[PDB]
Write a protein that binds this ligand. Structure first.
Ligand code: HEM
Ligand code: HEM
Ligand SMILES: Cc1cc(N)nc2cc(-c3cccc(CN)c3)c(F)cc12
Ligand SMILES: Cc1cc(N)nc2cc(-c3cccc(CN)c3)c(F)cc12
Ligand SMILES: C[C@H](O)[C@H](O)[C@H]1CNc2nc(N)[nH]c(=O)c2N1
Ligand SMILES: C[C@H](O)[C@H](O)[C@H]1CNc2nc(N)[nH]c(=O)c2N1
Ligand SMILES: [Zn+2]
Lengths: 415, 415
């Protein structure tokens, strides 16, 4: 109730009181810790009219307290105002300013995100007036253009109409706005991104004509107000890409690798005051390792370690030659150098984890804590030589938040 | 109560029922996860006569069930036999075979240990007849000689008399049997191992004459039956060491690095059936990364990244040149090659984490689970390209176990 987290590389000590305001549950118990379960049963997402006003009052009480007007008349009138609208319609509508606050704090409370030092500079695009798949395509294009900003990336979220009944639900079926396609081969191996093989054939199912190459940017599949989703191709000039080259190894270009500049996740759900926004794509910029470690070297992904190590002339017989580690560092030096040479915003895992420690200092000071998931904060390479490896972290679930949600193609009453 | 852990690199699914037998607590709650707190308040260590028989009966019930004699007469007579001895003396004495079983299962249940595939081949040296610091020195020397086995390392534990009253307590004050000394300098920097700077001056306090070099093997500080601890120097021919060289970089020898062959931790407490063994050094062999990543590159340790990167001719201005990662992989290739060229048993983090997955399969099959701490299982470099990064793990505390304990010099009623 006044718990302490220690840093063991600096002996810095911090006191968490923010975990007291925590509301959601973790999945752990006194006799079990599930801190390494990937999609815990609590991190996923239907609510009745009854539970909705405590959730609104809870939200509005932090909102007005945050603009130095806690408990005043403007706050009490708004509590009553929402109360009455939840009487009338059994739901309610957020003010524009309450929507911006709730979105910025969902990101703030995302314990698995190492980038949250920037949480307050989030551009919020209100798309709650949207009604059709084409309207969503327009909103998403304007999002992609704004956030990309010619390589000077800017953080943003686009918020589509909230869930109401549950059957009229806006959904982006893509897991990200910009993703490369995955194609299964006759022999069984995979061209493109294996992660998206199931989605790539859903697009062909709905009528996509696939170029059947490596880095083919998938189309968007947009579902508006419960209707069946529709295909649209993002204008190519809006999809900024970085060809990957090395600042020593000239043969690195021959690999013919590239990645997109904009990481923009679209399959998650934003929860604000008890309201659920099922379509809410949000974007930032990449930490290098998400591309060069996970995207490029996960076994179940592009899996390029063996062909990079070949061209490096590496001892690939013994596991203990660390040829895998050795080729992994070159691939990440290449992604960083490539993005930087092209003036596309990217951050390295050293600078981003030093920034998160800096962020943690600020949240324990001006908020009394920072929910943080070590399993996810620690970068996927060189963990112990980044300062977050030695920083104890308390994980707890605060709201507003981002939550996972099932894929629409396994839950949609089709047609 | 029938929880499931998934592997996301293979889609292999396992069912944990062993967590049902769990007894100790984790530190997490429904509203908080402390899976990244290093020394949780539960992982540390005085017990009365009352709670001691459930703990014995609990232990003896798994022991006899494990040798295919559950609930027989030999088991019921032993339950009564211990019962009566706990009536008489309010403690009890383990059979030789109950001691070997309890020790092997403490290691089996160590969720932070990636090496547990070997848990059943542990050599147990019973030192419960010891009474003096010199006797302990003799037992520890025989341990070091046996486990080292001329570089063909063998796992072992030496078990000193159990705690009874609490004031007559056997303790090894060293954190490990073989550790390098740490000396503070006039300017403030550190010669040797910074980790041991506080211990190195306790030895000089008790009269150690320090050679004041880099890799000076500390003396042993042995406390017998509550008496004040005494200094003894391990015969140098028993301390096997590996000079560190690279299989490409000839300048790597110039660094003048070496490490000891035998990892043998002596500051922890073994708990079996409610009995507490305060001195119980145990040893195995090294995973490469414990030396080349943590020992050599932790900021608060030897911290050799900058001087390795210098001699590598690295771009050391920008953080995003990944010069740190690049020099870290060379240092670990060197430790592995050095130990192997000298026929000292070492394992690389790839082979050890593939073995642990293999181990996890066996424990979920023939035991119904495997307690495992992801925060500690995942190696400190190249996390995601080893199979444990993608393996969900349930952590829970089973007994017999190894526990942490305070340092004796902050708890001993001195003289
Ligand atoms: C500004 C640049 C940003 C950087 C460098 C960054 C970095 C990261 C990284 C590396 C992860 C782990 C991802 C993975 O391993 O696949 C992550 C997770 C996440 N990020 Fe951030 N991010 C940024 C912006 C944002 C923004 C703007 C939002 C939301 C508006 C956001 C929300 C999230 C969420 C919700 C998760 C994980 C959700 C979960 O699994 O519970 N991030 N971020
Ligand atoms: C056989 C070769 C072994 C290998 C390769 C191995 C490997 C490891 C490694 C890498 C760690 C993490 C250590 C660190 O990061 O500082 C660890 C922890 C640990 N090992 Fe093993 N180990 C071995 C044998 C043993 C044996 C024989 C025992 C006990 C009899 C043991 C008990 C433990 C315990 C109790 C911990 C962590 C305790 C805690 O923090 O709760 N290990 N091991
Ligand atoms: C906005 C943003 C930026 C970034 N640099 N990275 C991000 C990574 C994720 C993410 C979270 C969980 C799983 C996955 C992979 N599907 C990605 C995310 F939501 C948003 C990210
Ligand atoms: C036996 C054995 C072998 C090995 N290869 N490694 C081991 C590492 C530890 C260990 C556990 C917690 C903290 C520390 C560092 N003080 C070491 C340990 F107890 C025993 C180990
Ligand atoms: C903060 C964190 O709990 C602490 O640094 C832990 C993280 N994981 C670790 N894992 C291992 N194997 N060894 C360690 O010392 C640590 N340190
Ligand atoms: C098994 C484990 O929970 C899973 O692989 C997690 C581990 N930590 C991670 N950390 C990040 N940043 N991203 C991930 O996808 C994962 N995967
Ligand atoms: Zn937990």
């Amino acid at each position: 109730r006044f718990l302490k987290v220690k840093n063991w590389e600096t002996d810095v000590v911090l006191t968490d009181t923010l975990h007291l305001k925590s509301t959601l549950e973790t999945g752990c118990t006194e006799h079990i810790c599930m801190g390494s379960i990937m999609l815990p049963s609590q991190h996923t997402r239907v609510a009745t009219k009854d539970q909705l006003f405590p959730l609104a009052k809870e939200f509005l009480d932090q909102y007005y307290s945050s603009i130095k007007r806690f408990g005043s008349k403007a706050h009490m009138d708004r509590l009553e105002e929402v109360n009455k609208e939840i009487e009338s319609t059994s739901t309610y509508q957020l003010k524009d300013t309450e929507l911006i606050y709730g979105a910025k704090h969902a990101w703030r409370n995302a314990s698995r995100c190492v980038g949250r030092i920037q949480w307050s500079k989030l551009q919020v695009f209100d798309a709650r007036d949207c009604t059709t798949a084409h309207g969503m395509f327009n909103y998403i294009c304007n999002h992609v253009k704004y956030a990309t900003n010619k390589g000077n990336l800017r953080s943003a979220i686009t918020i589509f109409p909230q869930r109401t009944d549950g059957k009229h639900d806006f959904r982006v079926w893509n897991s990200q706005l910009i993703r490369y396609a995955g194609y299964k081969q006759p022999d069984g191996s995979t061209l493109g991104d294996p992660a998206n093989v199931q989605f790539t054939e859903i697009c062909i199912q709905q009528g996509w004509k696939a170029p059947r190459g490596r880095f083919d940017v998938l189309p968007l599949l947009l579902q508006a107000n419960g209707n069946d989703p529709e295909l649209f191709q993002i204008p190519p000039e809006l999809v900024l890409e970085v060809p990957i080259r090395h600042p020593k190894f000239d043969w690195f270009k021959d690999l013919g690798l590239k990645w997109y500049g904009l990481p923009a996740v679209s399959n998650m759900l934003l929860e604000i005051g008890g309201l659920e926004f099922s379509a809410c794509p949000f974007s930032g910029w990449y930490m290098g390792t998400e591309i060069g470690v996970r995207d490029y070297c996960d076994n179940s992904r592009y899996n390029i370690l063996e062909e990079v190590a070949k061209k490096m002339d590496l001892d690939m017989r013994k596991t203990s030659s660390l040829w895998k580690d050795q080729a992994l560092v070159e691939i990440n030096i290449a992604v960083l150098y490539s993005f930087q040479s092209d003036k596309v915003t990217i951050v390295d895992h050293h600078s981003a984890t030093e920034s998160f420690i800096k962020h943690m200092e600020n949240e324990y000071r001006c908020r009394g804590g920072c929910p943080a998931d070590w399993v996810w904060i620690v970068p996927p390479m060189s963990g112990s030589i980044t300062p977050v490896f030695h920083q104890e972290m308390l994980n707890y679930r605060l709201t507003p938040s981002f939550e996972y949600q099932p894929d629409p193609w396994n839950t949609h009453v089709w047609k």
